[PDB]
Design a protein around this ligand. Structure first.
Ligand SMILES: Cc1cc(Cl)cc(-c2ccnc3cc(CN4C(=O)CCC4=O)sc23)c1O[C@@H]1CNC[C@@H]1F
Length: 329
């Protein structure tokens, strides 16, 4: 904390990618404030996932020493290494934020999860030579981008929206109209304030290819309609990295918490300052791979990364967490 201003977490081992995600969610400041507001006074000390996330966030905000996650792993039942390796980061993040969102219902901080992370997309199937079109509106909290044969995020987004032909052997079952030539596609209606992009490093053959992501990411061309008052310019907030072995390896996260190009490497207990280039360019890959990226929308940056004070944690919660620290010591 003395060098960088920020504390790290206790070592991974079986934990894998949780520490990387916890720092990412902790430095989503608007979420952190909302997490502190959850009415967890009635909750069980051990079994409550909402309370266990308040504990980590509290300790990341106040501790000089590294913060433990053992109370938190016991709460949502992922104790073994197998339980992390079977899942991916978006599934873990979904498990934490569902608990948080459910606890926030009927409270002053309701709807903070969908405000921060929920975007909307339309999937469509249009028949070419017949008048039939199926549409589904879908909420998403995260996007999984393809990287095999893609130079960069721009190209992955182009491929994400690209129109697929349903011709020949793979014609579209159109019900009363029978098999038809058709065009399948997806289109983004809105992009959230905090954008979670996972990069598909497994097709399970692994992909160590060089994949380039920028500091500033404009996404207006991937929307159906563009607001001129609020363009879809996104700014790079976090880069989650894996090195070494599969079914194992070492997980790190790079972060610029204030959103001001001032980057730090979060290597469990060791938080240290780094260059933009160590955080961005040097995690592109080729012959160490980035696997998740977090972008924040430029128009939403002040609100998402709003300053936290110790006053933002309710007195009842502070007293309860210090009662644990006294009794356990
Ligand atoms: C071993 C390993 C290496 C790398 Cl470099 C990234 C991940 C990783 C960690 C967390 N989250 C994601 C999300 C990803 C994107 N992705 C999907 O969602 C479906 C297919 C895929 O690629 S890769 C990854 C990883 O660990 C993984 C855990 N479970 C499977 C691996 F063992």
């Amino acid at each position: 904390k003395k060098h960088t201003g920020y504390v790290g977490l206790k070592n991974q081992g079986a934990t894998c990618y949780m520490n990387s995600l916890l720092q990412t969610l902790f430095f989503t400041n608007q979420l952190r404030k909302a997490v502190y507001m959850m009415p967890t006074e009635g909750d069980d000390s051990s079994k409550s996932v909402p309370l266990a996330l308040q504990r980590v966030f509290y300790e990341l905000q106040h501790s000089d020493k590294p913060v433990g996650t053992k109370k938190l792993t016991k709460s949502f039942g992922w104790e073994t290494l197998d339980s992390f390796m079977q899942h991916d980061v978006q599934e873990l993040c979904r498990v934490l934020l569902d608990n948080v969102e459910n606890k926030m219902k009927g409270t002053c901080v309701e709807g903070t999860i969908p405000k921060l992370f929920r975007g909307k997309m339309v999937s469509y199937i249009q028949c070419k030579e017949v008048d039939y079109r199926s549409d589904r509106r879908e909420d998403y909290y995260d996007i999984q981008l393809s990287i095999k044969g893609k130079k960069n995020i721009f190209e992955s987004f182009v491929d994400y929206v690209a129109v697929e032909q349903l011709d020949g052997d793979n014609k579209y079952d159109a019900g009363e109209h029978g098999l038809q030539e058709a065009e399948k596609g997806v289109k983004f209606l809105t992009l959230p304030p905090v954008l979670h992009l996972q990069l598909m490093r497994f097709m399970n053959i692994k992909i160590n290819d060089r994949f380039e992501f920028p500091e500033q990411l404009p996404l207006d061309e991937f929307l159906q309609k563009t607001d001129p008052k609020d363009p879809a310019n996104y700014i790079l907030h976090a880069v989650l990295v894996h090195s070494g072995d599969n079914h194992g390896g070492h997980y790190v996260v790079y972060l610029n918490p204030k959103g001001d190009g001032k980057w730090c490497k979060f290597d469990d207990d060791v938080v240290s300052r780094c260059t933009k280039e160590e955080a961005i360019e040097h995690n592109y890959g080729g012959h160490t791979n980035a696997y998740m990226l977090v972008y924040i929308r430029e128009s939403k940056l002040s609100e998402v990364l709003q300053a936290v004070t110790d006053h933002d944690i309710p007195q009842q919660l502070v007293e309860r967490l210090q009662e644990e620290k006294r009794i356990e010591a």
